[PDB]
Amino acid sequence: AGACIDGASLSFDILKTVLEALGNVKRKIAVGVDNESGKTWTALNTYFRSGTSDIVLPHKVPHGCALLYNGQKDRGPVATGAVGVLAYLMSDGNTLAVLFSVPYDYNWYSNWWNVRIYKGKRRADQRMYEELYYNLSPFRGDNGWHTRNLGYGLKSRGFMNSSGHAILEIHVSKA
Secondary structure: OOOEEEHHHOOHHHHHHHHHHOOOOOOEEEEEEEEEOOOOEEEEEEEEEEOEOOOOOOOEEOOOEEEEEEEEOOOOOOOOOEEEEEEEEEOOOOEEEEEEEEOOOOOOOOOEEEEEEEOOOOOOOHHHHHHHHHHOOOEEOOOOEEEEEEEOOEEEEEEEOOOOEEEEEEEEEEO
8 A cells, every 4th residue: 555666766756745645733754764675564553652654654665666655744723743663674684674753832842854774674663763763863854955875885965954844855875
């Protein structure tokens, strides 16, 4: 049920179009992850600290394919954002985890994102969220591209804007 587009076609416009497809809520995010790691990824699970998603992770992501995912704040006057982690098991047996954080209150928080490869199979949970958010140098949603050596012969290059209607674009390629 998850859309896997051609890797080379992933763009900011694709993600903005994904945002429009979701309801008109104050906080939501469109995520695009381009797999050019040379290895196939199999969806593990997702962990949402805040907010939810009306879809599921694309089960299988071959090399050359970009998964499209999305999330949103729960509807209602309550002050909640869209905060979560998605995890993918790679063919080498390691875990590629991605954190996205789209807060409600911009006086108290900023958009943050992070990506990391853990050794072995590790499901996304609150422990991984806390680690990726506070301890593992997340990147701020600042409209900038940032490169992060992931280890294991792979690198990441991603972008995330600074507004509630956020888009997060990540490319995982060989180092």
